[PDB]
RNA sequence: CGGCCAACUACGUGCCAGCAGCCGCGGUAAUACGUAGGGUCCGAGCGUUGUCCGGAAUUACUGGGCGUAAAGAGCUCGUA
RNA sequence: AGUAACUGACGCUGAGGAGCGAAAGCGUGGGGAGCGAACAGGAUUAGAUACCCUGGUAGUCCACGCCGUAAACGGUGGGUACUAGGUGUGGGUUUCCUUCCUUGGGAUCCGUGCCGUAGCUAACGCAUUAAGUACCCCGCCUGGGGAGUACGGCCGCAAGG
């Protein structure tokens, strides 16, 4: 399959702040992407979840451009 | 020689386009009296040939009783289906005690003088089938003691050991 | 099981409902 | 005595068995290592049965007695034929017709009826009828014949029935097993043991090991086939 | 629950040595703190109900322990009854 | 919980039965060994023996198979049980499998089978059947 | 000792994966398949499909008994376990590195005529402009796609 | 519109080509035919053979 | 005196008269109604009714069960 | 989950009893976009107190309180020990392939599914998460209707329980 990107030794953490990481995981439409479809673990999929969710609230990720 | 119980007439049906097919099933007990018996359950157009059919495979399927001289070893209690027939050895000049099924199955295997009662599922294939397994948990004290490694004399008691001698 | 057992219960339960609508009023000036 | 050595069937892969997922737990007796995903059998198990399995046969056709070559995967399928036609014995290699064992008397008449088609080959009555009778009964004599193979010389039952792969004939094992017969079989890992009573642990989807342990059965059978 | 520190001098005042800490008079006194705070808080959030049942249960717990010390010996149920201001 | 051992020795031993097994672990105790040696001299199992455990003691137990890998008990029940208990006089002493089966009774002298309490006539607790 | 011999014997055998070339000798040729022995649990299995590029060739003609061929493997357990192989995805990615390699020189198959779809044991396509049937001739190859092993020839 | 079938349900509509759906559909057939120039003719027999619409 | 449950035929009648512990018998050809032969079980007795126990493991201590047949409280805490 | 420093049988169950308890419903005060019992027309129908359409009040929402019911179901009470395995998936510790990136694989503890032995069942099926083998405690059943109804009693503003 897919590899964790962020269980590696090499994973970057997950913040609201940088915004090309969490651009780099929603769809063209802003759509979060699936998990499958990403293959990180589900403790990693639900921090990317909320970082695009605060950051959508911040006003640095459109609301389904 | 042998002797023969057949022990259920039954006239069983399957439904078809134009109506009702009837054929006839038999449960027949096939022994000799002298510890053999055997249980067949036939089914045919017609009584007779039902009743050769369950007559030959019980004679197919044979199993000798562990007899003590005249009655079981122990008492047993067996259930198959939901059939449950309880034996118990009785003393010599007691006769067979026990209903219908249980009654022709005992006195084809040759048991003399038993108590043998039906604690349920009154039908008579199970109660056949609960007693076949009930004969078939007695255990011969020659084999009790080779399965514990002991002398026949200090596994049965003496009482046994007397009616063998007798037997003999 | 066979739904035909809840169906008698549901038809004897609906009409002694049935039955304490019709006489609310005449149980209440009796009680 | 042994006629193969402990080097001969383990280079052939009796050593290898099944994947670890499709194991029988009951074959733990057996079993000595598990390896890159598969169970390995020890050898000196399979050894001190199979001296065992050699005199049981021995002793079987010593006393006037018959064993069946039982196999249907093609892995030991030609194999088992050319022992049969090297010993003489009978054997099933394309599909175990369910029942030749228990229904023993009714499969005979297909013999009988092989024969008979056999007669009228000699006699010659290919003409004699419709073309569309003739080639309807040549392709049932091809279907019998192709069916039965070593059949022909059934007489009166298999003293003793030697299969490959029991997995796959099933069958045959319960047949052999509602009869009495003995069942002398080269179980594999996924087997189980309790359904064939002298058993040769070893691998059967290998052509090389099936081979071998269809010599040995052979060399016993022709040993006690001499010694009458 | 309690931070480390109150755990530790509540242990302290407490415990029968300066080691123990599942002593029963230990753990009743940790229990009755924490009974305390818990209603303190659900005297703001009443009808916050799932914290009412963990409190049921540490009730629970507390009578259990008090059983357990006044059947062992009644002289230590009496002063933890009366250190710890409890009533039944 | 755990509520009576004698009962729990006696389901491991038949579980162990049933599956086959060769051997059982399990708890020791004054009791249990008793009831072993006791089942041991009757020969319904094949040897007992006591290890060290990493807390108390242990209790390993060969069940006995015969050729035929059939086994050698056919029964294992218990009788007098926590709640109601059992007690027997030494005139009115229980008969297993009409005398072929073991009545295991616990009375002043110890551990016996039921002839050797009816031979001495003394009466106990009927602890278990076996068969 | 006994268990350091087997152990050694055990060692010898050798391991695979799925995407390998693995070497073996043909042991039946059948109707249907085509078994091949490489030294393991079971016997390799090659379809008839998966024999050779052309779409009626026979197993029997192509592969005898005996013979020796290298082929990959695509799936290690079946539901019998058994392995399936294939030597022409064998020969696919083999000839395809020898494209690469050439990247010419090879035979037609199909006669279009608006060019020639030369067979090279791959599908080459030259322009009719620049350039018929079972001939060989040589050009510059212009588009690989690697993908389906496509490519384009000059 | 989906939900249930029955004997006189509308046959789903199937287009010639496999689904595929926008997730990892991608654009793996690259073809660079011919960019010779032709005229109208020259270029319709370059379609006839091809069967290419 | 159809089967349980030992012991069958004829006549009269016909959804009537009637019988019946249950199943169930009376629709011009009834071994189930009424009468005659014949038979069987008892015998100074023979049947019916009423009451109790058994069969009823159908209150199951000996000796029952609760997924779908009746039966697991809606779920926890806790007093005796 | 790990360490196991600490107390040393302090455990389990629990008649009654207390608490929590979907939705609907009731009381006081707010709010009311969408949906929408009741209620109007329209349509279908032999008849439409319905299904479909156009509107639409309570209600759905918030605060404080009541009621105490559900196919409140896994139709499977709680605790414990044992009885072949194979494979998904969640959480935590650790050994060896070792790149140590990698569901590498192994071991182990705690959950959550699927398939399958023995065993159990009337059968369907359950099968280490037992409906298997046993022990402790509680609740419940004794043919179907009449009936979870009448009377009496307790609770509730009422519906009713």
Same mark, same amino acid.
């Given at each position: 399959?897919?590899?964790?990107?962020?269980?590696?030794?090499?994973?970057?953490?997950?913040?609201?702040?940088?915004?090309?990481?969490?651009?780099?995981?929603?769809?063209?439409?802003?759509?979060?992407?699936?998990?499958?479809?990403?293959?990180?673990?589900?403790?990693?999929?639900?921090?990317?979840?909320?970082?695009?969710?605060?950051?959508?609230?911040?006003?640095?990720?459109?609301?389904?451009? | 020689?042998?002797?023969?119980?057949?022990?259920?007439?039954?006239?069983?049906?399957?439904?078809?386009?134009?109506?009702?097919?009837?054929?006839?099933?038999?449960?027949?007990?096939?022994?000799?009296?002298?510890?053999?018996?055997?249980?067949?359950?036939?089914?045919?157009?017609?009584?007779?040939?039902?009743?050769?059919?369950?007559?030959?495979?019980?004679?197919?399927?044979?199993?000798?009783?562990?007899?003590?001289?005249?009655?079981?070893?122990?008492?047993?209690?067996?259930?198959?289906?939901?059939?449950?027939?309880?034996?118990?050895?009785?003393?010599?000049?007691?006769?067979?005690?026990?209903?219908?099924?249980?009654?022709?199955?005992?006195?084809?295997?040759?048991?003399?003088?038993?108590?043998?009662?039906?604690?349920?599922?009154?039908?008579?294939?199970?109660?056949?089938?609960?007693?076949?397994?009930?004969?078939?948990?007695?255990?011969?004290?020659?084999?009790?003691?080779?399965?514990?490694?002991?002398?026949?004399?200090?596994?049965?008691?003496?009482?046994?050991?007397?009616?063998?001698?007798?037997?003999? | %099981?066979?739904?035909?057992?809840?169906?008698?219960?549901?038809?004897?339960?609906?009409?002694?409902?049935?039955?304490?609508?019709?006489?609310?009023?005449?149980?209440?000036?009796? %009680? | 005595?042994?006629?193969?050595?402990?080097?001969?069937?383990?280079?052939?892969?009796?050593?290898?068995?099944?994947?670890?997922?499709?194991?029988?737990?009951?074959?733990?007796?057996?079993?000595?290592?598990?390896?890159?995903?598969?169970?390995?059998?020890?050898?000196?198990?399979?050894?001190?049965?199979?001296?065992?399995?050699?005199?049981?046969?021995?002793?079987?056709?010593?006393?006037?007695?018959?064993?069946?070559?039982?196999?249907?995967?093609?892995?030991?399928?030609?194999?088992?034929?050319?022992?049969?036609?090297?010993?003489?014995?009978?054997?099933?290699?394309?599909?175990?017709?369910?029942?030749?064992?228990?229904?023993?008397?009714?499969?005979?008449?297909?013999?009988?009826?092989?024969?008979?088609?056999?007669?009228?080959?000699?006699?010659?009555?290919?003409?004699?009828?419709?073309?569309?009778? @003739?080639?309807?009964?040549?392709?049932?004599?091809?279907?019998?014949?192709?069916?039965?193979?070593?059949?022909?010389?059934?007489?009166?039952?298999?003293?003793?029935?030697?299969?490959?792969?029991?997995?796959?004939?099933?069958?045959?094992?319960?047949?052999?097993?509602?009869?009495?017969?003995?069942? @002398?079989?080269?179980?594999?890992?996924?087997?189980?043991?309790?359904?064939?009573?002298?058993?040769?642990?070893?691998?059967?989807?290998?052509?090389?090991?099936?081979?071998?342990?269809?010599?040995?059965?052979?060399?016993?059978?022709?040993?006690?086939?001499?010694?009458? | 629950?309690?931070?480390?520190?109150?755990?530790?001098?509540?242990?302290?005042?407490?415990?029968?040595?300066?080691?123990?800490?599942?002593?029963?008079?230990?753990?009743?006194?940790?229990?009755?703190?924490?009974?305390?705070?818990?209603?303190?808080?659900?005297?703001?959030?009443?009808?916050?109900?799932?914290?009412? =049942?963990?409190?049921?249960?540490?009730?629970?717990? =507390? =009578? =259990?322990?008090?059983?357990?010390?006044?059947?062992?010996?009644?002289?230590?149920?009496?002063?933890?009854?009366?250190?710890?201001?409890?009533?039944? | 919980?755990?509520?009576?051992?004698?009962?729990?020795?006696?389901?491991?031993?038949?579980?162990?039965?049933?599956?086959?097994?060769?051997?059982?672990?399990?708890?020791?105790?004054?009791?249990?060994?008793?009831?072993?040696?006791?089942?041991?001299?009757?020969?319904?199992?094949?040897?007992?023996?006591?290890?060290?455990?990493?807390?108390?003691?242990?209790?390993?137990?060969?069940?006995?198979?015969?050729?035929?890998?059939?086994?050698?008990?056919?029964?294992?029940?218990?009788?007098?049980?926590?709640?109601?208990?059992?007690?027997?006089?030494?005139?009115?002493?229980?008969?297993?499998?009409?005398?072929?089966?073991?009545?295991?009774?616990?009375?002043?002298?110890?551990?016996?089978?039921?002839?050797?309490?009816?031979?001495?006539?003394?009466?106990?607790?009927?602890?278990?059947?076996?068969? | 000792?006994?268990?350091?011999?087997?152990?050694?014997?055990?060692?010898?055998?050798?391991?695979?994966?799925?995407?390998?070339?693995?070497?073996?000798?043909?042991?039946?040729?059948?109707?249907?398949?085509?078994?091949?022995?490489?030294?393991?649990?079971?016997?390799?299995?090659?379809? &008839?499909?998966?024999?050779? +590029?052309?779409?009626?060739?026979?197993?029997?003609?192509?592969? &005898?008994?005996?013979?020796?061929?290298?082929?990959?493997?695509?799936?290690?357990?079946?539901?019998?376990?058994?392995?399936?192989? &294939?030597?022409?995805?064998?020969?696919?990615?083999?000839?395809?590195?020898?494209?690469?390699?050439?990247?010419? !020189?090879?035979?037609? +198959?199909?006669?279009? !005529?608006?060019?020639?779809?030369?067979?090279?044991?791959?599908?080459?396509?030259?322009?009719?402009?620049?350039?018929? +049937?079972?001939?060989?001739?040589?050009? !510059?190859?212009?588009?690989?796609?690697?993908?389906?092993?496509?490519?384009?020839? &000059? | 519109?989906?939900?249930?079938?029955?004997?006189?349900?509308?046959?789903?509509?199937?287009?010639?080509?496999?689904?595929?759906?926008?997730?990892?559909?991608?654009?793996?057939?690259?073809?660079?035919?011919?960019?010779?120039?032709?005229?109208?003719?020259?270029?319709?027999?370059?379609?006839?053979?091809?069967?290419?619409?």
């Amino acid at each position: 399959t897919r590899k964790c990107v962020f269980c590696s030794k090499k994973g970057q953490t997950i913040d609201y702040k940088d915004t090309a990481l969490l651009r780099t995981y929603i769809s063209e439409r802003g759509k979060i992407r699936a998990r499958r479809v990403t293959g990180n673990c589900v403790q990693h999929q639900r921090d990317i979840a909320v970082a695009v969710k605060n950051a959508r609230e911040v006003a640095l990720l459109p609301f389904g451009s | 020689n042998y002797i023969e119980r057949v022990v259920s007439i039954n006239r069983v049906s399957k439904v078809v386009k134009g109506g009702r097919r009837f054929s006839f099933t038999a449960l027949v007990i096939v022994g000799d009296g002298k510890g053999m018996v055997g249980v067949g359950y036939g089914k045919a157009k017609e009584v007779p040939a039902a009743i050769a059919k369950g007559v030959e495979e019980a004679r197919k399927n044979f199993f000798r009783v562990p007899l003590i001289g005249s009655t079981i070893t122990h008492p047993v209690q067996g259930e198959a289906a939901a059939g449950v027939v309880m034996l118990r050895p009785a003393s010599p000049g007691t006769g067979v005690i026990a209903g219908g099924a249980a009654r022709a199955v005992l006195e084809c295997a040759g048991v003399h003088d038993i108590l043998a009662k039906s604690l349920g599922s009154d039908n008579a294939i199970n109660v056949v089938h609960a007693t076949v397994a009930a004969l078939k948990l007695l255990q011969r004290p020659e084999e009790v003691a080779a399965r514990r490694g002991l002398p026949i004399e200090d596994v049965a008691p003496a009482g046994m050991l007397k009616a063998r001698r007798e037997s003999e | %099981g066979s739904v035909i057992k809840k169906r008698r219960k549901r038809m004897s339960k609906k009409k002694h409902r049935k039955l304490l609508r019709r006489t609310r009023v005449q149980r209440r000036k009796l %009680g | 005595m042994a006629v193969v050595t402990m080097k001969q069937l383990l280079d052939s892969g009796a050593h290898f068995g099944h994947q670890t997922r499709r194991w029988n737990p009951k074959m733990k007796r057996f079993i000595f290592t598990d390896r890159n995903g598969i169970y390995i059998i020890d050898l000196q198990q399979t050894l001190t049965y199979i001296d065992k399995a050699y005199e049981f046969v021995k002793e079987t056709v010593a006393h006037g007695g018959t064993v069946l070559f039982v196999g249907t995967k093609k892995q030991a399928q030609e194999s088992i034929a050319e022992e049969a036609t090297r010993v003489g014995m009978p054997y099933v290699n394309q599909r175990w017709l369910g029942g030749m064992l228990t229904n023993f008397s009714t499969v005979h008449k297909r013999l009988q009826r092989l024969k008979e088609l056999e007669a009228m080959e000699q006699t010659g009555g290919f003409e004699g009828r419709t073309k569309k009778e @003739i080639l309807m009964l040549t392709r049932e004599k091809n279907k019998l014949e192709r069916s039965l193979g070593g059949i022909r010389d059934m007489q009166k039952v298999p003293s003793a029935v030697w299969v490959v792969d029991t997995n796959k004939e099933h069958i045959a094992v319960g047949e052999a097993r509602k009869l009495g017969i003995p069942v @002398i079989a080269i179980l594999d890992t996924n087997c189980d043991p309790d359904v064939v009573d002298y058993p040769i642990p070893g691998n059967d989807d290998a052509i090389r090991s099936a081979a071998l342990l269809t010599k040995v059965i052979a060399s016993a059978v022709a040993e006690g086939l001499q010694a009458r | 629950a309690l931070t480390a520190e109150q755990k530790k001098e509540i242990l302290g005042q407490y415990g029968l040595h300066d080691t123990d800490t599942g002593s029963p008079e230990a753990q009743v006194a940790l229990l009755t703190k924490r009974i305390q705070d818990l209603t303190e808080h659900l005297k703001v959030h009443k009808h916050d109900h799932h914290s009412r =049942r963990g409190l049921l249960l540490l009730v629970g717990r =507390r =009578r =259990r322990l008090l059983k357990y010390v006044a059947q062992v010996d009644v002289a230590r149920y009496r002063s933890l009854i009366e250190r710890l201001g409890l009533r039944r | 919980t755990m509520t009576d051992p004698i009962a729990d020795f006696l389901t491991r031993l038949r579980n162990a039965n049933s599956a086959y097994h060769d051997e059982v672990t399990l708890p020791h105790s004054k009791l249990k060994a008793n009831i072993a040696e006791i089942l041991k001299r009757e020969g319904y199992i094949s040897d007992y023996r006591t290890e060290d455990a990493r807390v108390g003691k242990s209790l390993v137990v060969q069940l006995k198979y015969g050729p035929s890998r059939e086994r050698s008990i056919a029964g294992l029940r218990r009788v007098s049980k926590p709640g109601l208990r059992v007690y027997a006089k030494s005139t009115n002493l229980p008969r297993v499998l009409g005398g072929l089966g073991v009545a295991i009774i616990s009375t002043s002298s110890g551990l016996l089978t039921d002839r050797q309490a009816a031979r001495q006539g003394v009466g106990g607790e009927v602890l278990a059947y076996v068969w | 000792s006994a268990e350091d011999f087997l152990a050694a014997i055990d060692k010898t055998i050798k391991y695979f994966n799925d995407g390998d070339i693995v070497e073996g000798t043909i042991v039946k040729v059948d109707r249907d398949e085509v078994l091949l022995d490489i030294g393991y649990k079971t016997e390799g299995v090659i379809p &008839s499909r998966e024999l050779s +590029i052309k779409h009626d060739v026979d197993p029997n003609e192509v592969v &005898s008994v005996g013979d020796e061929v290298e082929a990959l493997v695509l799936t290690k357990e079946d539901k019998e376990g058994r392995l399936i192989l &294939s030597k022409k995805r064998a020969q696919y990615e083999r000839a395809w590195g020898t494209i690469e390699e050439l990247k010419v !020189k090879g035979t037609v +198959i199909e006669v279009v !005529k608006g060019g020639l779809i030369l067979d090279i044991g791959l599908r080459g396509f030259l322009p009719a402009s620049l350039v018929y +049937i079972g001939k060989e001739i040589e050009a !510059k190859i212009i588009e690989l796609d690697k993908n389906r092993n496509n490519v384009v020839l &000059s | 519109a989906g939900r249930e079938w029955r004997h006189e349900s509308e046959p789903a509509r199937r287009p010639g080509y496999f689904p595929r759906p926008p997730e990892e559909r991608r654009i793996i057939r690259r073809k660079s035919f011919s960019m010779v120039p032709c005229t109208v003719d020259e270029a319709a027999l370059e379609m006839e053979m091809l069967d290419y619409d």
